[PDB]
DNA sequence: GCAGATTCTACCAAAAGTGTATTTGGAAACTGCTCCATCAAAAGGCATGTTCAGCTGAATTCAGCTGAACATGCCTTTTGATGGAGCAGTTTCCAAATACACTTTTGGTAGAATCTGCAGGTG
DNA sequence: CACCTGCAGATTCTACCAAAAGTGTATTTGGAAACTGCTCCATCAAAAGGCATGTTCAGCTGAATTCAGCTGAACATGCCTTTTGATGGAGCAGTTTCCAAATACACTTTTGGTAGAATCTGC
């Protein structure tokens, strides 16, 4: 049985997703997370569907860009595997936790 | 009669821009040349982004500019990338870019 | 209530640069956000500028300085020429 | 007294006074002495063997004695090579093209002797045509290699500065003629002294050059519209001359005959040229454009890579516009 | 209006494969097992912050519906300007 | 001949400079640098004295905070020595390079 | 002995900045890198300050021109007016 | 006549805040309570920082607040530090802080 | 020409909070910068709030929402109570 | 001991507060109508959970060599004193910006109709 | 990846028009322009406090080596998101009424800022 070596498919996935633009988090699950969080802030809120899509476009752009920085932090440490400490260093330098 | 846009040789609406400047509460007064100059700049920046986005669309064998083309245009252009450095273009995706050390083999 | 957008003007310019190229509604929405965004940025820089100089008037001179403060190198140069040209022409026509 | 470095061919030796004249804070007579000696060592195997004698690599720029023991070793070594050259070994040929490291050095030597005060040329306020010319060696080499020069061609440098680009092209490639025109009086005046000095120094080193003229004129003028059209290789330096000037130069590349190539540091039209329904004023209706590779080792003072852009006159662009308009 | 199901633990709807995909778009080739929970925690903070401001705009306007514009303005305030939704 | 080990004095200096607030670049050289840069944007300018001082207070606070991020990057790579690649990583994540 | 102005930002001055920044050991290459970074910082802030100077038709850069420049660059400074 | 500040029980100048709001081109109109509310907010924030700054002067055995004390008060306070996260207090210095890995191995 | 600042009011507050504590010139200038900075942020946020809602008036309500958007948690809560208290007190006075 | 903060007298345009009359933004009131929440049903795109082992991260060891500490010596910076380059305060005056009444042009947009780029599947 | 079919999204017209935008007198005034006084900036001299440079070696960086076990790849299974539709109605948003509160002067009062003189005090 044929097997690509570890990393081969990962690289293929990188090329595929960097070529496309569709959102990567499932839509309904993201909508529920938005509603759950909003509900804890204020009860009985309604949402325009484009308000939830706007939050999703912004959340995914934010996460993709944070993973780029995280990746640079792992590579800086001579690793190719991102780890919680890379995300933390990236957020600290960005002033998100500084 | 003639529009202030025609007198200035512009496609963008000088009248509209003058109005928006007044309603925006930017200053007590707005001179006549302000909206002309501003409409001209907005028109120029939009010409620049559409020039590059239409080229990205052509590069991708498409006739219709979509958000991805606006993003490729902006991100592949040093100055537009900086001007929009803190802006997210919805459905824009990102530029293909794989860090070298992550590629296989050697040499 | 009528809601304005720069759409028809963006379209006119699109036709000048790329005659046979169209634009999707989502891209046009992005272009409308872009124009509003830069308008606000330039207008706000102009406002502060005038206030800093105790002037109650925003003239093309404040727009020009705001443009220089806001735009990167080559874009500022070209924007400046286009605006200057538009005003000189405007003032010659009346 | 003085320090003398004698010619390998027995042209006329180069004399450097003592005390050493300084041209600027980065170029002095001493550093020219050291550079000559390295490059002559590289051309003549035997010379370098004779530079092995006595003390070597303990000379320093300033100190009469330290530079005189090097000069004196060189002058003896030249004599020996001249006696040898009467024999089985023959003179350094003047049909041999120069190598890139050697060519760079010949222009550097020449430069210092024409321009006795380059800092003054470097004071310019950005955004005007007075902005002093000259380009890095690497860029000019990129042009020479990629855009072939043939002996059915004519080379012209609009905004040549001290004319070192023209000179470099003329020693390295042949053409019918090679020219430099420069507007601002000070760098152009120097351009004449460069043309003469360059010719003296090419013989001195025993290497081949073509035929060239550096001319003092104004490249932002009516006469030069015709010069450009009957020319087929235009190098033009611009970027920091202002949009106003970019328009007027563009108009003059418009006058150019089909086939003509323009090498510039200015993208006169987009790379990917698309039609406009008002390209009756835009230069791109008559040229294919592609951007040449940025070269690192030629950074500015903002630390930006300098590019050149290859534009080729092709009227097919124009022919297609017109046909689309004839339709319907 | 009768009932309305309780919302809980929806952060788990941000699955391991979705996070892997987002990291791939971000150019990531290998991922430690601890990254998934860390990313959920970071996304929750991001969302709480933007949603808090967006809802603040909603309440100020005395509306009960969070609009795309309330989100656009909230994003802009946070230095995350978003184009494409009226903003 | 007494001799402190490598690092002992470095640590001593960190403690000393983190306790004080005086500027650490000498004034005149900073002023010359400022004037030279400004001359490229507009010739024959004068500077109020407070203008140069504000530029120095801002420039020093910028470099000191950048050194803090640089230090976290070197430490992230298991080093205690800052290197150019650490400053570059920090600037890229801050978005000054990005 | 001459001296390039940016070189006036000396190794010792840079080390002190680094110390206040908590830095214990420094690579020799750090000094030039720092100078380059500082020049870019000053070019960006001074360019804007001078833009405000010129707009005001002045020949003197004021603290306020600098404060406004720093503020628009997201580097708000307290203590010099504004 | 009683000053608007006294009526509001404030030390900060309501009248001046109203004037600054009007001429700042923030809106065509400015209601009566706006400058009062805003002045009160500015007063409160001022009291908060001076309160912590004064405490820092005290801990340092000083009776006069200098920039250093304002910096220590702000950077040691989670909320003030975030409010002033992009602000530089001239002559403030930084908080004493050495990364643990840099300390000698006692 | 008059140069206004918040110096005298900052000083009155200092005396309420630390009666026997003084403040240097540089520190006071920092406090003046602080007050002007917060004033501008709050005012700008209130300005945007009214424009977003197409209102010509900045009232205590826009100031309140601006405060909740700009200040961190506890600071916002106390600022809001202080502001509400002052407008109450003010409104109840011949 | 002293640079810088504090106390005090005197001057006054600038503000700020009070009084009067007019103007108006936007709240309540009623309501048209978009679009949000929600239930339904179907199904396949994906999430989940597992197996297996490639190769990565983490540990350990070690030697070259780069930076830290430091002693040695002078040149660039800091400090204090002095003509003017202009930053500002004042006065004059018009080009140009509100304010206001019509008159005309135009960008939206509601509704129905036909077009056309390319998503999506295939080989 | 070029070719080819079905379709949602897009560019194609008709008619209505209030909101724009523009054309035309009257009235108002912001700020360019010129002259000028008062700062405070540039520059020079000299009293003053680091910095540049070469030597020595401690200990750090990074190379080489090893391996436990994490994490990627592939796979089986089937859940739940997605898609297509419909519907009640919450509530957003349009329209008219109309006062509480804001703008708009005009006038009286107080007040914060500035300038100069001189004593006081934290550090
Ligand atoms: C950037 S400099 C050229 C430097 C040199 N050509 C090089 O490549 O290094 C441009 C030159 O263009 C010249 N120039 C501008 N307009 C010109 C004109 N109309 N005729 C001749 N020379 C002109 C200027 O005087 C200026 O020296």
TrEMBL record, chain B:
What is the annotated localization of this protein?
Chromosome; Nucleus
Q: What is its main location?
A: nucleus
A GO CC annotation given for this chain: nucleus
Which GO annotations describe the biological process of this protein?
heterochromatin formation
Q: Where is the Histone H2A C-terminal domain?
A: 78-107
Keyword Repeat included in the entry's annotation: no
The portions of this protein that span the membrane are none
Keyword field: Acetylation, Chromosome, DNA-binding, Isopeptide bond, Nucleosome core, Nucleus, Phosphoprotein, Ubl conjugation
Q: How does it assemble?
A: The nucleosome is a histone octamer containing two molecules each of H2A, H2B, H3 and H4 assembled in one H3-H4 heterotetramer and two H2A-H2B heterodimers. The octamer wraps approximately 147 bp of DNA.
Function of this protein?
Core component of nucleosome. Nucleosomes wrap and compact DNA into chromatin, limiting DNA accessibility to the cellular machineries which require DNA as a template. Histones thereby play a central role in transcription regulation, DNA repair, DNA replication and chromosomal stability. DNA accessibility is regulated via a complex set of post-translational modifications of histones, also called histone code, and nucleosome remodeling.
Q: What is this protein called?
A: Histone H2A
Q: Tell me the organism's taxonomic lineage.
A: Eukaryota, Metazoa, Chordata, Craniata, Vertebrata
